């Protein structure tokens, strides 16, 4: 049974057990990827919501970890969705949104920033094709109504930036107090 009192430890266990696995097509592990995002954010003075959003944005890849959430086949195929479904019970909606919309953010930036498409890694370019390509104009206008647009975009940049072959970072457990602060802001 998961609650405000053990969710941080649960997620930490996933980092401990699964974090050494490969972030597919990139020169980082799953943990390195998310920790780099969090650390780049922290080093640059980003707020804790963005740091933690970056830290957790790819936890939904590990779908066999979430049996207690009873997710359907659609909420499973898409890691951005599975991750948000896990987090929405414990975290501020800003953080949940950063995770849920991190693929849409890529599609949005491809549609709205002219030189953005060319600066992506081929793993991200390959995934874009299967994720529905750039947004159309309707999708862009819909996306810009999101009140958390700024944080969502910040987390996408941190996603793209967290693929360094070498970077010193703290481990999950050094960020865990911050994760708990976000949980406690929400669950009060």
Q: Which residues bind Fe ion (CB under 5 A)?
A: 58, 159
Q: How far is the CB of 105 from Fe ion (least distance, A)?
A: 10
* Partners of residue 29 on adjacent β-strands: 22
In the complex, what is the shortest distance from the CB of residue 158 to Fe ion, in angstroms, rounded to a whole number?
9
Cβ at position 86, least distance to Fe ion in Å: 14
Indicate the residue among 32 and 58 with the shorter CB distance to Fe ion: 58
Residue number, 32 or 159, with CB nearest to Fe ion:
159
Nearer to Fe ion, 58 or 97 (CB): 58
Residue at shortest CB range from Fe ion: 159
Which residue, 123 or 141, is less far from Fe ion as judged by CB?
A: 123
């Amino acid at each position: 049974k998961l609650n405000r009192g053990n969710i941080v430890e649960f997620i930490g266990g996933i980092f401990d057990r699964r974090g050494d696995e490969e972030y597919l097509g990139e020169p980082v592990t799953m943990a390195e990827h998310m920790l780099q995002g969090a650390t780049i954010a922290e080093q640059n003075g980003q707020p804790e919501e963005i740091i933690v959003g970056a830290l957790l944005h790819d936890i939904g890849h590990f779908t066999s970890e979430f049996g207690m959430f009873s997710m359907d086949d659609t909420e499973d195929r898409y890691h951005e969705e599975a991750g948000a479904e896990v987090l929405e019970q414990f975290f501020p909606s800003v953080i949940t949104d950063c995770v849920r919309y991190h693929v849409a953010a890529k599609r949005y930036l491809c549609a709205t920033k002219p030189e953005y498409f060319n600066r992506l890694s081929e793993a991200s370019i390959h995934s874009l094709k299967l994720q529905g390509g750039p947004m159309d104009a309707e999708e862009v206008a819909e996306f810009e109504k999101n009140p958390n647009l700024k944080q969502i975009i910040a987390v996408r940049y941190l996603d793209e930036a967290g693929k360094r072959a070498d970077m010193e970072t703290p481990d999950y457990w050094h960020f865990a107090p911050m994760v708990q602060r976000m949980v406690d802001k929400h669950m009060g």
